[PDB]
Design a protein around this ligand. Sequence first.
Ligand SMILES: *[C@@H]1O[C@H](CO)[C@@H](O[C@@H]2O[C@H](CO)[C@@H](O[C@@H]3O[C@H](CO[C@H]4O[C@H](CO)[C@@H](O)[C@H](O)[C@@H]4O)[C@@H](O)[C@H](O[C@H]4O[C@H](CO)[C@@H](O)[C@H](O)[C@@H]4O)[C@@H]3O)[C@H](O)[C@H]2NC(C)=O)[C@H](O)[C@H]1NC(C)=O
Ligand SMILES: *[C@@H]1O[C@H](CO)[C@@H](O[C@@H]2O[C@H](CO)[C@@H](O[C@@H]3O[C@H](CO)[C@@H](O)[C@H](O)[C@@H]3O)[C@H](O)[C@H]2NC(C)=O)[C@H](O)[C@H]1NC(C)=O
Ligand SMILES: *[C@@H]1O[C@H](CO)[C@@H](O[C@@H]2O[C@H](CO)[C@@H](O)[C@H](O)[C@H]2NC(C)=O)[C@H](O)[C@H]1NC(C)=O
Ligand SMILES: *[C@@H]1O[C@H](CO)[C@@H](O)[C@H](O)[C@H]1NC(C)=O
Ligand SMILES: *[C@@H]1O[C@H](CO)[C@@H](O)[C@H](O)[C@H]1NC(C)=O
Ligand SMILES: *[C@@H]1O[C@H](CO)[C@@H](O)[C@H](O)[C@H]1NC(C)=O
Ligand SMILES: *[C@@H]1O[C@H](CO)[C@@H](O)[C@H](O)[C@H]1NC(C)=O
Lengths: 596, 199
Amino acid sequence: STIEEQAKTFLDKFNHEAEDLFYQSSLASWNYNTNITEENVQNMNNAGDKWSAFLKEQSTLAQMYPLQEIQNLTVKLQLQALQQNGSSVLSEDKSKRLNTILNTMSTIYSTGKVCNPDNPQECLLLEPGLNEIMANSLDYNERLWAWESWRSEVGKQLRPLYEEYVVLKNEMARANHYEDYGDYWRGDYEVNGVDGYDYSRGQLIEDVEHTFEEIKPLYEHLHAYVRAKLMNAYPSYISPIGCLPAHLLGDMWGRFWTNLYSLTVPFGQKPNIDVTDAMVDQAWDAQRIFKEAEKFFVSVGLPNMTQGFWENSMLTDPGNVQKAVCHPTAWDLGKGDFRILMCTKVTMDDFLTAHHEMGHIQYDMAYAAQPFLLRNGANEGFHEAVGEIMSLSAATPKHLKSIGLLSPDFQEDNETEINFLLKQALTIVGTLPFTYMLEKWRWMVFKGEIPKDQWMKKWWEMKREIVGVVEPVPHDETYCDPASLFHVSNDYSFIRYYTRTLYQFQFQEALCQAAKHEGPLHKCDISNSTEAGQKLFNMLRLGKSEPWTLALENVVGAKNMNVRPLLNYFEPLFTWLKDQNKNSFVGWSTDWSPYA
Amino acid sequence: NITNLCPFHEVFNATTFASVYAWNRKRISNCVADYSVIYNFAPFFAFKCYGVSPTKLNDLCFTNVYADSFVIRGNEVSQIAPGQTGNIADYNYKLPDDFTGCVIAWNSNKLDSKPSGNYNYLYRLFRKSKLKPFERDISTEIYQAGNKPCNGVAGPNCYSPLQSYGFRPTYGVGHQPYRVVVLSFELLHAPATVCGPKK
Ligand SMILES: *[C@@H]1O[C@H](CO)[C@@H](O[C@@H]2O[C@H](CO)[C@@H](O[C@@H]3O[C@H](CO[C@H]4O[C@H](CO)[C@@H](O)[C@H](O)[C@@H]4O)[C@@H](O)[C@H](O[C@H]4O[C@H](CO)[C@@H](O)[C@H](O)[C@@H]4O)[C@@H]3O)[C@H](O)[C@H]2NC(C)=O)[C@H](O)[C@H]1NC(C)=O
Ligand SMILES: *[C@@H]1O[C@H](CO)[C@@H](O[C@@H]2O[C@H](CO)[C@@H](O[C@@H]3O[C@H](CO)[C@@H](O)[C@H](O)[C@@H]3O)[C@H](O)[C@H]2NC(C)=O)[C@H](O)[C@H]1NC(C)=O
Ligand SMILES: *[C@@H]1O[C@H](CO)[C@@H](O[C@@H]2O[C@H](CO)[C@@H](O)[C@H](O)[C@H]2NC(C)=O)[C@H](O)[C@H]1NC(C)=O
Ligand SMILES: *[C@@H]1O[C@H](CO)[C@@H](O)[C@H](O)[C@H]1NC(C)=O
Ligand SMILES: *[C@@H]1O[C@H](CO)[C@@H](O)[C@H](O)[C@H]1NC(C)=O
Ligand SMILES: *[C@@H]1O[C@H](CO)[C@@H](O)[C@H](O)[C@H]1NC(C)=O
Ligand SMILES: *[C@@H]1O[C@H](CO)[C@@H](O)[C@H](O)[C@H]1NC(C)=O
């Protein structure tokens, strides 16, 4: 008959075999991740090979249906996803070359190691020692030397392979109808076919730039305060008007500023909010923590976990011969099986991470009724924001008092709120310019406007411009600094960490508004409220069946991302930082260089 | 003396309930029917009687009894009802609008699931038209969907009509096997010859 009926017939088969193949592959992956053995690796290889092969013939067969004869707009999305995500266009030699290059990237990042100068006796790896050194050690020479040494021993090797990589990726883009790989990445947010909700790929760059324009004053005030405080630690090295040295940010790349909290406490005399000793006194185990997390979800109206989740999931490190990765993850094996994999200790951080991970499980259970190809979030940002909005409420003093970990005798005034807001700020606000810088530089390099011989040249020039950080040691084109990043080496889109953050504060401000809350925004709880729960669930159950602009409209009432809630969240800190910056110069100078 | 007891410990205890698209039908006649023994099983996920009262089963007595048994997924049991619609209702087992009887449905996960996967339970996913009430279909022919007749071979727009369930112990409720038994009664111009025990 018509094309529509044939396409529906084909989809009604595809779904049925897809489900089973996905289950097999995901179960093999879980079996390896909880039981590290060679035969588990072989099982993963076999299952993944079967799944990846099946996707290939399905992508080939889907070509016979032209997309201009579909007007339902729901079949079209499934057909587009199936056609795109499994199609290969490069020649066999180029394909295997690209695969080998990617495998080399991963292998060299994992196996990379640096160690002490002029001593080949003993050496260490990045995760065990380097992270601890840059997080805790205060030695200027040690930090600067390690920061230089890892880059020298990694980026120099990775540079020519990246030069070969970018080419192949660009021809991959060119063979398709995209302009370049950058636009291929930007196509995730593309929306077409709906009047009043269309979103163009090029609009994202302008939106990102406009959003970053408004948030500059808060970042520069925080930068001035950080510079003033850091003057106490390293007086000689730091200039009152220059950019901060790149090796004094508390981590390897300066992605997060959390490690500087102790060095930059606003009021150290006053006690800090800590409940670890309270949980120790009350003899809390992992099951109690997860039951409390589940009760928090029940209190808002969302259904709680099934029996299979309790029986199958593991929450403690097996130890002994049984070795497994303790990176917290939320597995959705499909066909009604949800699990959480994490090793739990009796700490506040694990208590909050439990809620953060459980949010993902609830979101996964929300859209279980949708077809297989539409079982995902509206874009790459919603999923992360959903799991983060709830850790904000979990950490508020009111929730802790209601649960009982915090004594009722606790009081709130200036310093408690200021310290909490500053601790949140050094984690949230600091990372935005870094992410925007990295993504913009990668967009430019993929655009091809920048020649290879200036790759480093521009890289640092814009570092002193936006981020306001100057490198401590000059580098030539031999080094490839961005290659030292985990995400860059492993071919992962990085813009999702900028859209996620600005999303979450839009959600919270909405829910707190629905919960009839009054007072400061940062002290908000939604435990008893149920209207916010149903309003959230209405968007959660949608999945990918609707454009993300409409989904955003159904919760807040706007068709675009906004910055006002984020600033409104940190406004009391903004006023106090304005007060503290009366005698301190605002703005960094790009002319200064630490190495004379 | 109550001697001829209707056999109910056979339809409820056969250990092999066959596939849905080929459902076994049993005719019960010429015996004393006791309905108190069905309750001696595990708690039943679905126990629904439409035209009769559960307490008034033993006194009223009818001509013959028809028993149907099969296995379906957990969340499809809601489709076994008069007036319902869906794949299983209109392609494998259709019930009349004025159906009179009872429907039994209970979970059997511990007996119809293996870690490797059970592929011995089938169902129909494509049919040219709908099914009349109380009908079965066993024919297996390639369901042509495209204009070109592909002469009954597998390929584009030519799919096998019989799909296959999968069953493993690690599934979640709603994808686990469920055993369903339907009882049907009727009357006509004939001696009853089938009644429950009298005290
Ligand atoms: C079309 O095909 C593409 C690729 O072929 C598929 O894309 C994949 O989609 C999944 C689903 O999001 C991606 O998985 C995500 O990867 C992120 C990257 O993390 C890496 O690094 C960490 C260590 O930091 C590793 O542990 C991890 O395994 C990755 O190697 C993760 O961060 C994501 O996890 C997030 O969500 C979980 C909850 O689900 C949280 O608990 C986490 O904290 C975190 O917030 C997530 O796992 C995957 O990366 C994509 N592939 C690529 C190459 O990008 C599409 O799925 C496919 N579309 C289909 C089939 O419809
Ligand atoms: C685009 O295609 C989809 C899928 O073919 C269409 O969804 C279908 O919508 C109809 C009604 O809108 C659904 O019918 C309903 O079926 C249930 C039983 O599942 C029944 O109880 C209801 O009374 C109703 O008859 C149908 O199920 C649904 N398809 C699927 C696979 O769920 C959609 O309507 C199409 N778009 C447009 C604009 O028509
Ligand atoms: C949501 O409702 C529950 C049920 O009352 C609240 O739990 C009580 O909290 C008070 C503190 O205000 C305690 O004194 C009670 O002992 C708690 N009762 C139970 C049964 O836990 C909970 O505090 C409410 N949530 C919020 C944020 O107020
Ligand atoms: C892990 O793998 C080994 C090797 O096959 C197996 O004997 C064991 O049962 C598996 N599971 C656990 C929990 O060790
Ligand atoms: C939450 O779990 C309990 C069992 O601990 C259960 O009794 C209750 O019904 C669940 N909540 C909902 C809304 O079903
Ligand atoms: C602390 O809060 C009180 C509110 O009564 C206010 O009067 C005072 O100025 C605040 N102090 C600072 C340093 O902001
Ligand atoms: C009937 O079911 C019971 C339940 O335990 C079982 O022991 C018995 O063997 C069954 N009879 C058969 C299968 O003939």
